[PDB]
Amino acid sequence: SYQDYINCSREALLEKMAELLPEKRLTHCLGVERAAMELAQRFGVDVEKASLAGLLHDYAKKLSDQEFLVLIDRYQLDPDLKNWGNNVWHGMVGIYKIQEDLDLHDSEILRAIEIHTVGAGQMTDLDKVIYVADYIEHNRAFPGVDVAREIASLSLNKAVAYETARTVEYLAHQGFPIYPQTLETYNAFVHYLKE
Amino acid sequence: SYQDYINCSREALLEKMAELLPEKRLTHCLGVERAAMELAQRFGVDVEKASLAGLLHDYAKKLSDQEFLVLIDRYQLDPDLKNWGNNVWHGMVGIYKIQEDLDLHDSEILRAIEIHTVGAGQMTDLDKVIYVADYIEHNRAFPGVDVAREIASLSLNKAVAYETARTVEYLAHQGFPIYPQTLETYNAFVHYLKE
Ligand SMILES: Nc1nc2c(ncn2[C@@H]2O[C@H](COP(=O)(O)OP(=O)(O)O)[C@@H](O)[C@H]2O)c(=O)[nH]1
Ligand SMILES: Nc1nc2c(ncn2[C@@H]2O[C@H](COP(=O)(O)OP(=O)(O)O)[C@@H](O)[C@H]2O)c(=O)[nH]1
Ligand SMILES: [Fe+3]
Ligand SMILES: [Fe+3]
Ligand SMILES: [Fe+3]
Ligand SMILES: [Fe+3]
Ligand SMILES: [Mg+2]
Ligand SMILES: [Mg+2]
Ligand SMILES: [Mg+2]
Ligand SMILES: [Mg+2]
């Protein structure tokens, strides 16, 4: 059960999240919970750790900038983090709010949430499952989500590769700054697109 | 005259380059020489340093992988350079071959050639002129070269921004590794696209 990792039941958690997140965002988290379970079954990852990390991954999506800045100071995180914003913060810094609220201390689950947006050069299979689940969950409708879904049915690594390449491409298309850890993921995984 | 910086005349240099480079590549270098002069006039850069750096920028385009690897060892350059290829090497490492052949020691000209492909987070106006001249020279015909030309008529910084964003975008589109210094340039300049 989820209470093996956090300080409340799944139902209690959903009630809490429903007050923290807009409906669309909670529906997304439920989609990621389901997609993570499916991916974990396929690729040999603990389904429960995957489901819980999937449900929790966007728990901190709505924290204020000021809240994130307070957390960076309090936990003495990389000071360069203050040069970024919610996109980087909600996973990389938001894990500390999840930990405070829910008594989440499992290192694997925390790491998977931490890097769910940007990835890393080295990712555990759990990390990859969350990173991909987030992108392919049933409620997502962006062009090429179908390609991502097909790839994810066959290869976890290639699915990470596809997502990271499409993300870097779109960030540059839009003219948005690219977090250096995002590039680390990109350069580590892009070769799988030849797979 | 060019002999103020190198060990031969412009005519002698062209004769040498014609044996080192395919016709198309030498024509490109001549295009960059001209474009660099125009940009330097517009943006307050020494026209002669610009023209010479423009002509020379792709001098090392055709060196073998083995030649580049020898230069990396000989000059004890960043050992990470061995993980890359001609795209990174021809400017970043090729400057040493230019220096050996032509007795080029001018630090400003060398730096502008060095970073002409990838840029840097901090670029001199000469660096920017070469970086942009390369992209917009008259022989270039790629989609959106017209946009780059228009921007370059107005703002050197915005032209760097446009080129770097389009390059990162295309590298991710194609699935090619992105050199970390390229990202440094991208993150430093992308804000100018709001200009
Ligand atoms: N500026 C910036 N945004 C990024 C980067 N990587 C991902 N993002 C964006 O962060 C946003 C949230 O991403 P993610 O956490 O994966 O999905 P979500 O929380 O379900 O929307 C998206 O718009 C991504 O494109 C980056 O390196 N830089
Ligand atoms: N793999 C890779 N290629 C790059 C990077 N930056 C630029 N290039 C490519 O290097 C090639 C040569 O670039 P450049 O020196 O600017 O132009 P050229 O020498 O006149 O063709 C082009 O195909 C660029 O897209 C990078 O970060 N990684
Ligand atoms: Fe997220
Ligand atoms: Fe999400
Ligand atoms: Fe070049
Ligand atoms: Fe060139
Ligand atoms: Mg994040
Ligand atoms: Mg993250
Ligand atoms: Mg180069
Ligand atoms: Mg270069």
Side-chain angles (χ1 to χ4, degrees), chain A residues 7 18 20 28 30 35 72 107 114 122 149 157 171 175:
Chain A
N7 63 191
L20 299 172
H28 163 70
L30 287 161
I72 291 158
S107 70
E114 187 194 353
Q122 300 267 36
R149 284 165 181 159
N157 285 334
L171 290 165

Side-chain angles (χ1 to χ4, degrees), chain A residues 166 169 173 176 178 186-187, chain B residues 169 172-173 176 178 186-187:
Chain A
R166 296 291 68 74
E169 186 181 357
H173 184 88
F176 300 151
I178 295 162
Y186 176 86
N187 283 336
Chain B
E169 186 181 357
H173 184 88
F176 300 151
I178 295 162
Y186 176 86
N187 283 336

Side-chain angles (χ1 to χ4, degrees), chain B residues 28-43:
Chain B
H28 163 70
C29 290
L30 287 161
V32 180
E33 183 188 36
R34 185 201 275 182
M37 175 169 267
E38 298 173 352
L39 287 166
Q41 279 197 307
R42 179 174 310 123
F43 296 119

Side-chain angles (χ1 to χ4, degrees), chain B residues 25 28 57-58 61 90 116-117 134:
Chain B
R25 186 57 52 181
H28 163 70
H57 81 286
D58 275 343
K61 186 79 168 179
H90 75 285
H116 84 266
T117 306
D134 185 32

Side-chain angles (χ1 to χ4, degrees), chain A residues 10-82:
Chain A
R10 183 178 175 275
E11 177 50 46
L13 174 64
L14 290 177
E15 284 165 19
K16 287 181 217 193
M17 292 181 70
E19 302 282 5
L20 299 172
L21 297 177
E23 189 186 24
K24 190 187 170 181
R25 186 57 52 181
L26 181 53
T27 299
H28 163 70
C29 290
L30 287 161
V32 180
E33 183 188 36
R34 185 201 275 182
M37 175 169 267
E38 298 173 352
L39 287 166
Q41 279 197 307
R42 179 174 310 123
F43 296 119
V45 170
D46 183 319
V47 299
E48 181 174 56
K49 290 198 176 207
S51 298
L52 181 53
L55 182 60
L56 289 175
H57 81 286
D58 275 343
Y59 182 97
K61 186 79 168 179
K62 299 314 285 204
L63 307 189
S64 75
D65 292 352
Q66 196 51 239
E67 286 176 283
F68 285 120
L69 295 164
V70 165
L71 291 166
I72 291 158
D73 282 346
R74 182 126 69 80
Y75 292 93
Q76 288 188 266
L77 305 179
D78 178 6
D80 179 72
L81 288 162
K82 302 200 174 178

Side-chain angles (χ1 to χ4, degrees), chain A residues 14-194:
Chain A
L14 290 177
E15 284 165 19
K16 287 181 217 193
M17 292 181 70
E19 302 282 5
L20 299 172
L21 297 177
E23 189 186 24
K24 190 187 170 181
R25 186 57 52 181
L26 181 53
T27 299
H28 163 70
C29 290
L30 287 161
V32 180
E33 183 188 36
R34 185 201 275 182
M37 175 169 267
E38 298 173 352
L39 287 166
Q41 279 197 307
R42 179 174 310 123
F43 296 119
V45 170
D46 183 319
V47 299
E48 181 174 56
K49 290 198 176 207
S51 298
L52 181 53
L55 182 60
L56 289 175
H57 81 286
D58 275 343
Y59 182 97
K61 186 79 168 179
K62 299 314 285 204
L63 307 189
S64 75
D65 292 352
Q66 196 51 239
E67 286 176 283
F68 285 120
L69 295 164
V70 165
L71 291 166
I72 291 158
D73 282 346
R74 182 126 69 80
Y75 292 93
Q76 288 188 266
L77 305 179
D78 178 6
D80 179 72
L81 288 162
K82 302 200 174 178
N83 302 133
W84 300 88
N86 189 283
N87 289 354
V88 175
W89 296 336
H90 75 285
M92 296 278 286
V93 183
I95 48 159
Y96 298 102
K97 180 69 163 147
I98 301 170
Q99 176 163 276
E100 286 169 6
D101 287 358
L102 304 182
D103 211 1
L104 178 66
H105 292 269
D106 185 84
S107 70
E108 285 170 4
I109 294 174
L110 285 161
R111 179 62 175 175
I113 298 164
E114 187 194 353
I115 67 169
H116 84 266
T117 306
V118 299
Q122 300 267 36
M123 297 178 72
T124 70
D125 289 351
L126 177 59
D127 298 336
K128 300 179 214 173
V129 164
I130 301 311
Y131 184 86
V132 173
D134 185 32
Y135 201 62
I136 70 166
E137 65 92 2
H138 153 267
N139 304 104
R140 294 279 207 218
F142 58 84
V145 71
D146 63 304
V147 181
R149 284 165 181 159
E150 179 183 323
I151 294 165
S153 80
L154 303 157
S155 171
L156 187 57
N157 285 334
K158 194 178 175 171
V160 172
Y162 180 84
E163 175 179 355
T164 190
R166 296 291 68 74
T167 297
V168 172
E169 186 181 357
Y170 199 55
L171 290 165
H173 184 88
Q174 296 292 91
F176 300 151
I178 295 162
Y179 194 60
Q181 194 158 310
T182 298
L183 176 65
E184 176 182 294
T185 308
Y186 176 86
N187 283 336
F189 285 86
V190 75
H191 76 271
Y192 289 113
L193 290 178
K194 300 171 142 252

